[PDB]
Structure formats: structure tokens, C-alpha cells
């Protein structure tokens, strides 16, 4: 992004953690996505389950 | 620490940009003040010149 | 920020001038004027500096620079006093450092400077050159800086270019010298930097100097011969950097503010003909700004440019343009007020001007004259069915039907449009 | 510019609808004229 418009904008991203509940993801592929879809028909479990 | 140097980088961007903006506003206002002096000196030049021609 | 790095380098060194406190090699008598006055933050120090009668302020520190000749130390000894000569809150202000005895201490001691441009020589020299506007002194010799290399070498290389430009735009506030500089080739210098595509902030500085020059009416009259304003509009369109547009709008406002003689202001029209700023100003009005200066300039431009658009609305000038044989695209060709309030004007003596345009359609086949005439005829004949029957009586309907076979397809299309303006009830 | 092209197409559509209306009217006239 900085290269596209040279402006030397560092776009600093600091890191933190608080009471926020984070999203949930686990990688799937063509050989397993439909099965994860069957699992997700019933909702999704808690973070880090 | 990369985080602390990054905080310093954010600071050096922020203060520098804000200084540049403030100085820019200052010079624009000063230029307007200079033209204010100019319009003013013109008005009173007219006010004086009238009586000057009269008396001479 | 190269100059900032140099300042960081030199500011971290406290000069060992106390060992030279009475040394004739360096500051035998100036070192008590550095021991005293070491606190530039003290008002009593500045008051004492005034008490000394300018005996050594801008009187002995000048030529103290010549007491010093080693380079690795000239920079630091320069900075040790130039922080005072530069920061300058109220310490010197209105040329408190008079030095009335000698004119080698007043100003024309700069000639030895401007040499070997690399160890901040021309740079402090330029700073000293910028000692006119907010100081109690006047530039004795304009020519001795107007053509020198201090401003020529900086054309291409660059924080120092910004520093020199800053010094120049600081210098460019008193119309007495600026009229002489514009009569000189300074405008050529600004043009050369302008056509030298560079950083956006540099462009802000050129447009800034141009606006400050636009303070003066005689100068805008002299610069009218140049196409400054179409290029300013093009920069505005092709470069969005906030302050750049701010100063550009300031320049436009100045140019439509002064207006010494409306006749020589053909730019009232050429500002929008060369670049119709109105659509962009509408897009900016659409946006909301907390700076009332920018919004005020925008509104002023909408107003003045609208008045100029209304000035373009006329029929005598438009008909002279019709008669000239070269149909320029004066914007009235599409004006709805032109085709409603004064459509009957086109029916001059026995439809005189329609006949003239018919003749010029028959004779000339340039694409744009044909387009202008055919479109205008269509817009007229829209409102006048008897005008349609008259145009049919002219035979020009068949002339357009034959223009339908011109080599350029745009001409065929505008003839097509004319025919479908005639097709109604036909 | 693209929506100006679209206005060009819209004007085309109205123009050709009017021209077909005019066509059918003119043909009606020609049908009238076929008789002694």
C-alpha cells in the first residue's frame, strides 16, 4: 500500500488484548469444507474449543 | 524494542505534521495581516492626499 | 530533514570557547558576549544586548565567521551564534543589531559566502539573505542576489531546496522588490521549477509564492501573458494534498479579487474554458470542512465563476463568432437559457443567421463547425415547427442528409441527430 | 461519460419508438393511397 502511493506512512499496528471475545476460524480445504459445513449447521463453539 | 521505536515513530509523525500545519496557518494569517496593513495605508494615503492638494 | 540532522549534530556540541575566553584566535572580546547572554531565555540578557549599543551584535560576530577558517569547527562556531540569529523570538526582532558604523557589518558582507555549496555554506547564507520582512532593515542591492547562483544551483538535485524556497517565499512579501523581481526573470525560474515535476510540497511552495505575488495587481497584469491559471487548475485536478488545493483556491480568489481592468481579464472565461473548475468545486462543496477559509474561497469561486458563465450568455458575441467562419465552442451552444429565452434571436432578418450557417455548412466541412451549426440548428428547430418548414424550404435538410456521408462518423452522427430533430411530425 | 453513453442509448430508444410510430402512420397513408 505504501508502494502504491509513496508517502512513507508507517501504518503502525500495535497489539493488545482485553475482555474482547475474538472471532473463531479453523482452516478448511476442498476435501474437508463440506464436513465443516455440516458441523457449522448447528452453530459454532467457543473460542479455542 | 520495536514497539517503543514505533511509538516514537508515531510521535515524530504526529508532532511534526501538526507543527507544519500550525506554521502554515500562521504564515497565511500573517500574509493576510500584511495585506491588511497595505489596504490601510492606501486608505489613509487617499485621506491625506486630498487635503494635500487642497492646501497647496 | 537533512538540515534537521545537521542541526541535531551541531546542537549536541557545547563549544569549548571558554578556553578561548580571551584568546585572540577565537573571540577575545566576543566570549564575554557569550558568557553573558548565555541565557537567551532571559529578558535581562536581551536588554543588556541592547545596552551594548550593537557594539558586537551583527558587528563582530560578523567577521567572527572570518576569524574561523577550519571547516570541522566552522560549522559548530557558526551554529553557536546562528541559533541566536535564527531562533530569534524577540532577541533581534526589528534589526536591534544595527551596527551603524560599518556597512561591512550591515549587509553587503554576504559576497564571500555562496561558495562551495555543501557544508551548510550557501544554507546559512540563504538564512542571512532572509533578513528583510520581519526585521528593521531593507535590501540595499536587489541585483546582488537576484541572478546569483544561490537560487540557480538548487534547480535540480534536497531538503536544502526546500530551505532555499522557504527563504525565498519569506523574502517575497514586500512588493517593492517583488515588482523588480517579476520584471526580472524570477517568473522564468518559477516556471522552470513548475515544469520540473517534483514533490507535492515543493509545488505547494511555488503556488504559495505565486499567490503572495498575486497580492500585487501590477504583477498579475504582467503575469497574465502566462498560462499560470490553467496549470494551477490542472495541478488541482491531478494532485489532491489538502493544503495544495487550499493555496490553489487562494490563488484563484486573488486573481478574481483584484480585476483591475475587466477587458484584459479574458481569464474570467479562460479559467473555466481551459478547465471547468465548477464540477470539482461542487464535489468540494459536497464535502464539509471545519476551515471556514476553504469553504469561503469555494463559495466565492462558485459565485464569481457563475457570474462569468452568465457573461458568456449573449447573442451578439455569439453571432459574431458564427460570422467569423471559425466556430469556437463558446459554451452558449448548449445553454438551456440560450434555447428558451433567446431562441427567436437566431431568426434574424428572413432567418439571416440560419442562412449564414447554412452557407458555412455547404462551404466548410470541418467536423467541429459542422457539429456546432447542426446542433444549434437542432436546438432552435426543436421549438419552432414553422422554423422546421423554413429550414426544409432552404434545402439545407438535404445538405445535412448529404453530410450524413462525411468521412468522419461523428459528423454523420450529428447529421443523424439533426434529422431526428426534424423527424417530428414528418 | 459512461452514463452519458447510456443517455445516448435512452435517446436512441425513444427516437426509434417514435420512428416506428411514424412508420406505421405513414404506411397507413400509403394504404389509403392505393385506390383510384
From Swiss-Prot, chain A:
Predominantly expressed in neurons in the cortex and in the dentate gyrus, CA1 and CA3 regions of the hippocampus (at protein level). Expressed at lower levels in astrocytes, oligodendrocytes and microglia (at protein level). In the cerebellum, present in Purkinje and granule cells (at protein level). It comes from the Eukaryota. Disruption phenotype: Embryonic lethal. Knockout embryos die at 5 to 6 dpc, before gastrulation. It is found in: Cytoplasmic vesicle, Clathrin-coated vesicle membrane; Cytoplasmic vesicle, Secretory vesicle, Synaptic vesicle membrane; Melanosome. Coiled coil: none annotated. The modification Phosphothreonine is found at residue 21. The modification Phosphotyrosine is found at residue 25. Belongs to the V-ATPase 116 kDa subunit family. Subunit of the V0 complex of vacuolar(H+)-ATPase (V-ATPase), a multisubunit enzyme composed of a peripheral complex (V1) that hydrolyzes ATP and a membrane integral complex (V0) that translocates protons. V-ATPase is responsible for the acidification of various organelles, such as lysosomes, endosomes, the trans-Golgi network, and secretory granules, including synaptic vesicles. In certain cell types, can be exported to the plasma membrane, where it is involved in the acidification of the extracellular environment. Required for assembly and activity of the vacuolar ATPase. This is V-type proton ATPase 116 kDa subunit a 1. It comes from Mus musculus (Mouse). The gene is Atp6v0a1.
Curated annotation (Swiss-Prot), chain B:
Expressed within the midpiece of sperm tail (at protein level). Kidney; localizes to early distal nephron, encompassing thick ascending limbs and distal convoluted tubules (at protein level). It comes from the Eukaryota. The modification Phosphotyrosine is found at residue 55. The modification N-acetylalanine is found at residue 1. Subunit of the V1 complex of vacuolar(H+)-ATPase (V-ATPase), a multisubunit enzyme composed of a peripheral complex (V1) that hydrolyzes ATP and a membrane integral complex (V0) that translocates protons. V-ATPase is responsible for acidifying and maintaining the pH of intracellular compartments and in some cell types, is targeted to the plasma membrane, where it is responsible for acidifying the extracellular environment. Belongs to the V-ATPase E subunit family. V-ATPase is a heteromultimeric enzyme made up of two complexes: the ATP-hydrolytic V1 complex and the proton translocation V0 complex. The V1 complex consists of three catalytic AB heterodimers that form a heterohexamer, three peripheral stalks each consisting of EG heterodimers, one central rotor including subunits D and F, and the regulatory subunits C and H. The proton translocation complex V0 consists of the proton transport subunit a, a ring of proteolipid subunits c9c'', rotary subunit d, subunits e and f, and the accessory subunits ATP6AP1/Ac45 and ATP6AP2/PRR. This is V-type proton ATPase subunit E 1. The gene is Atp6v1e1. The chain holds residues 2 to 57 of 226 of the full protein.
Swiss-Prot record, chain C:
CDD domains: VATPase_H (cd00256). The modification Phosphoserine is found at residue 43. It is found in: Cytoplasmic vesicle, Clathrin-coated vesicle membrane. It is a peripheral membrane protein. Keywords: Cytoplasmic vesicle, Hydrogen ion transport, Ion transport, Membrane, Phosphoprotein, Transport. GO terms for biological process: synaptic vesicle lumen acidification. Subunit of the V1 complex of vacuolar(H+)-ATPase (V-ATPase), a multisubunit enzyme composed of a peripheral complex (V1) that hydrolyzes ATP and a membrane integral complex (V0) that translocates protons. V-ATPase is responsible for acidifying and maintaining the pH of intracellular compartments and in some cell types, is targeted to the plasma membrane, where it is responsible for acidifying the extracellular environment. Subunit H is essential for V-ATPase activity, but not for the assembly of the complex. This is V-type proton ATPase subunit H. It comes from Mus musculus (Mouse).
Amino acid at each position: 500500500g505504501t508502494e502504491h502511493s509513496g508517502s512513507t506512512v508507517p501504518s503502525i499496528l500495535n497489539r493488545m488484548q482485553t475482555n474482547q471475545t475474538p472471532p473463531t476460524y479453523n482452516k478448511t480445504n476442498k476435501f474437508t469444507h463440506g464436513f465443516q459445513n455440516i458441523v457449522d449447521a448447528y452453530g459454532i463453539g467457543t473460542y479455542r474449543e | 524494542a520495536l514497539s517503543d521505536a514505533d511509538v516514537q515513530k508515531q510521535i515524530k509523525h504526529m508532532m511534526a505534521f501538526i507543527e507544519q500545519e500550525a506554521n502554515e496557518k500562521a504564515e497565511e494569517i500573517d500574509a493576510k495581516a500584511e495585506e491588511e496593513f497595505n489596504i490601510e495605508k492606501g486608505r489613509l494615503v487617499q485621506t491625506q492626499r486630498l487635503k494635500i492638494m487642497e492646501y497647496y | 530533514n537533512i538540515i534537521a540532522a545537521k542541526a541535531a549534530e551541531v546542537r549536541a556540541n557545547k563549544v569549548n570557547w571558554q578556553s578561548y575566553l580571551q584568546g585572540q584566535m577565537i573571540s577575545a572580546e566576543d566570549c564575554e558576549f557569550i558568557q553573558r547572554f548565555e541565557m537567551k531565555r532571559s529578558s535581562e540578557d536581551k536588554q543588556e544586548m541592547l545596552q551594548t549599543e550593537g557594539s558586537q551584535c551583527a558587528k563582530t560576530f560578523i567577521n567572527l565567521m572570518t576569524h574561523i577558517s577550519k571547516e570541522q569547527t566552522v560549522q559548530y562556531i557558526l551554529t553557536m551564534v546562528d541559533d541566536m540569529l535564527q531562533e530569534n523570538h524577540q532577541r533581534v526582532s526589528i534589526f536591534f543589531d544595527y551596527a551603524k558604523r560599518s556597512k561591512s557589518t550591515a549587509w553587503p558582507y554576504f559576497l564571500p559566502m555562496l561558495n562551495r555549496q555543501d557544508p551548510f555554506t550557501v544554507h546559512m547564507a540563504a538564512r542571512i539573505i532572509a533578513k528583510l520582512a520581519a526585521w528593521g532593515k531593507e535590501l540595499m542591492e536587489g541585483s546582488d542576489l537576484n541572478y546569483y547562483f544561490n537560487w540557480i544551483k538548487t534547480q535540480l538535485s534536497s531538503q536544502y531546496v526546500q530551505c532555499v524556497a522557504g527563504c525565498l517565499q519569506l523574502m517575497l512579501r514586500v512588493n517593492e522588490y517583488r515588482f523588480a523581481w517579476v520584471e526580472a526573470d524570477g517568473v522564468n525560474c518559477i516556471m522552470g521549477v513548475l515544469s520540473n515535476k517534483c514533490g507535492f510540497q515543493l509545488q505547494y511552495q511555488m503556488i504559495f509564492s505565486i499567490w503572495l505575488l498575486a497580492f500585487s495587481p501590477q504583477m498579475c497584469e504582467h503575469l497574465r501573458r502566462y498560462n499560470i491559471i490553467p496549470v494551477l487548475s490542472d495541478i488541482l485536478q491531478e494532485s489532491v494534498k489538502e493544503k495544495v488545493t487550499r493555496i490553489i483556491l487562494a490563488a484563484f480568489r486573488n486573481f478574481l479579487e483584484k480585476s483591475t481592468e475587466r477587458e484584459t481579464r479574458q481569464e474570467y472565461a479562460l479559467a473555466m474554458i481551459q478547465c471547468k473548475v465548477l464540477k470539482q468545486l461542487e464535489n468540494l462543496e459536497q464535502q464539509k470542512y471545519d476551515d471556514e477559509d476553504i469553504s469561503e474561497d469555494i463559495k466565492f469561486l462558485l459565485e464569481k465563476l457563475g457570474e462569468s458563465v452568465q457573461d458568456l450568455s449573449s447573442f451578439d458575441e455569439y453571432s459574431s463568432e458564427l460570422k467569423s467562419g471559425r466556430l469556437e465552442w463558446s459554451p452558449v451552444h448548449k445553454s438551456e437559457k440560450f434555447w428558451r429565452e433567446n431562441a427567436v434571436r437566431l431568426n434574424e432578418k428572413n432567418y439571416e443567421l440560419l442562412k449564414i450557417l447554412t452557407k458555412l455548412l455547404e462551404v466548410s466541412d470541418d467536423p467541429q463547425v459542422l457539429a456546432v451549426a447542426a446542433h444549434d440548428v437542432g436546438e432552435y428547430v426543436r421549438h419552432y415547427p414553422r422554423g422546421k418548414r423554413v429550414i426544409e424550404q432552404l434545402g439545407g435538410k438535404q445538405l445535412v442528409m448529404n453530410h450524413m456521408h462525411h468521412e468522419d462518423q461523428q459528423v454523420r452522427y450529428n447529421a443523424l441527430l439533426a434529422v431526428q430533430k426534424l423527424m417530428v411530425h414528418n | 461519460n459512461f452514463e452519458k453513453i447510456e443517455n445516448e442509448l435512452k435517446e436512441i430508444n425513444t427516437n426509434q419508438e417514435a420512428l416506428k410510430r411514424n412508420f406505421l402512420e405513414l404506411t397507413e397513408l400509403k394504404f389509403i393511397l392505393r385506390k383510384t
